[PDB]
């Protein structure tokens, strides 16, 4: 009650620990339930993963890029795969059609520090690992039937 005034005891305490969390518990981390379905390739447990930033062509807010991690052994497919996780995990950013989930539908394009977009060359994609460049920044480029067939014909998507 307000009558008590103050909420601190004069109990003896040579060493503090109230401010910090007490151990006495195993220190470990667990992957999200949906993370295993998609994030399993996002190197969740791998702290050596590669961070990534995405700048959409329409990115009206270059200050809000996609923040995800990817393994050097998996494929870029994880990049867009997180999109489903991001929608439910943060309940933000308008949703994207699932049928468009297929990484083959969207392509990643390399960009310069100036934010310039290179349409003259594609960026990895389901065809290989993203960290191949070691950079944590990219932009999405249109992958019309022309590019879809090449990437799809090179690395077809697993059914079911």
Curated annotation (Swiss-Prot):
Record's comment on post-translational modification: Phosphorylated; under environmental stress.
Effect noted on mutating residue 90 to P: Decreased ability to recognize and bind AGC protein kinase family members substrates
Effect on the protein of changing residue 115 to E: Decreased ability to recognize and bind AGC protein kinase family members substrates
Phenotype when changing residue 54 to T: Decreased ability to recognize and bind AGC protein kinase family members substrates
Phenotype upon changing residue 70 to H: Decreased ability to recognize and bind AGC protein kinase family members substrates. Abolished ability of the TORC2 complex to catalyze phosphorylation of gad8
Residues annotated as domain CRIM: 15-152
Family: Belongs to the SIN1 family.
Function: Component of the mechanistic target of rapamycin complex 2 (mTORC2), which regulates multiple cellular processes to control cell growth in response to environmental signals. In response to signals, TORC2 phosphorylates AGC protein kinase family members, such as gad8. TORC2 is required for cell survival under various stress conditions. TORC2 positively controls G1 cell-cycle arrest, sexual development and amino acid uptake. Positively regulates amino acid uptake through the control of expression of amino acid permeases.
Domain free text: The CRIM domain forms a ubiquitin-like fold with a characteristic acidic loop, which recognizes and binds AGC protein kinase family members substrates.
Subunit structure: The target of rapamycin complex 2 (TORC2) is composed of at least bit61, pop3/wat1, sin1, ste20 and tor1. Interacts with the sty1 MAP kinase.
Protein name: Target of rapamycin complex 2 subunit sin1
Source organism (scientific name): Schizosaccharomyces pombe (strain 972 / ATCC 24843) (Fission yeast)
Residues included from the entire protein: 247 to 400 of 665
């Amino acid at each position: 009650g307000p009558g008590h005034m103050g909420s601190v005891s004069n109990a003896k305490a040579p060493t503090s620990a109230l401010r910090a969390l007490l151990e006495h518990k195993e220190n470990s981390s667990q992957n999200g339930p949906l993370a295993e379905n998609f994030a399993c390739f996002c190197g969740h447990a791998e702290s050596n993963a590669l961070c990534l930033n995405i700048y959409f062509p329409s990115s009206e807010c270059p200050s809000k890029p996609l923040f995800v991690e990817l393994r050097c052994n998996v494929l870029v497919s994880e990049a867009i795969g997180y999109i489903l996780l991001q929608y439910v995990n943060q309940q933000c950013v308008p949703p994207i059609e699932d049928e468009a989930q297929n990484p083959n539908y969207w392509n990643l394009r390399i960009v310069e520090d100036d934010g310039e977009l290179d349409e003259d060359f594609p960026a990895l994609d389901r065809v290989g690992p993203l960290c191949k460049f070691g950079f944590d920044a990219f932009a999405l480029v249109k992958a019309c039937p022309a590019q879809i067939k090449e990437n799809q014909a090179c690395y077809p998507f697993k059914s079911k």
